[PDB]
Amino acid sequence: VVITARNNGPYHIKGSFRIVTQGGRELPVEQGQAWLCRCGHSLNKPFCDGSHKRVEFDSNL
Amino acid sequence: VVITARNNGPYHIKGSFRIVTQGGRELPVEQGQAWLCRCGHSLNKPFCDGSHKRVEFDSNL
Ligand code: FES
Ligand code: FES
């Protein structure tokens, strides 16, 4: 599994992994890839929905 | 690999994985486990530094 934190962007996850809530609810992994919100403002958490551009999330690693 | 998105807090990643920048730089993973900032406010991105509590991050999944 490789996690790429995109600059000014989401975490890109690729490989064989599961996403779960603290409660234990399985969230959907499609095609062994996901983009998870890193900016805090997605309206579809934990998935990135483009909100990072709206709030000009500034994080360059 | 299991990614647990903690309520009002970081992503917990457990298992065999790497973390890389979009630039290609490997980031240091301690003992098959990391907490990655979900709130957008860590001053040590991509790692959670407890800033989620300071800015009262609200995401209960
Ligand atoms: S990183 Fe894309 S919506 Fe937050
Ligand atoms: S989730 Fe803990 S610092 Fe952002």
Numbering used by the authors:
A (entry chain A), B (entry chain B): 5 to 65
What's in the article?
The recently discovered CDGSH iron-sulfur domains (CISDs) are characterized by one or two highly conserved 17-residue CDGSH motifs with a consensus sequence of [ΦCXCXX(S/T)XXXPΦCDG(S/T/A)H], where Φ and X are a hydrophobic or any residue, respectively. The [2Fe-2S] cluster is coordinated with three cysteine residues and one histidine residue in the CDGSH motif. We synthesized genes for a type 3 CISD (PcCISD) from Pyrobaculum calidifontis, which is a hyperthermophilic archaeon, a type 4 CISD (RsCISD) from Ralstonia solanacearum, which is a soil-born plant pathogenic bacterium, and a type 6 CISD (MmCISD) from Magnetospirillum magneticum, which is an aquatic alphabacterium that utilizes iron reduction to derive energy.
RsCISD adopts an intertwined dimeric structure with the dimer interface burying 1250 Å2 of solvent accessible area per monomer. Residues 6–66 of RsCISD are resolved in the structure and form five consecutive β-strands (β1 though β5) followed by the iron-sulfur binding module and a short α-helix, α1. The structure contains a β-sandwich packed by two intermolecular five-stranded β-sheets. Each β-sheet comprises strands β1, β2 and β5 from one subunit and strand β3′ and β4′ from the other subunit with the order β5-β2-β1-β3′-β4′ (prime denotes the other subunit). The β-sandwich is stabilized by a large number of hydrophobic residues (Ile7, Ala9, Tyr15, Ile17, Phe21, Ile23, Leu31, Ala38, Leu40, Pro50 and Phe51), which are highly conserved in type 4 CISDs. The two iron-sulfur binding modules are packed closer to each other in the RsCISD structure than in the mitoNEET and MmCISD structures. The interface between the two iron-sulfur binding modules is mainly polar, burying two arginine residues and four water molecules.
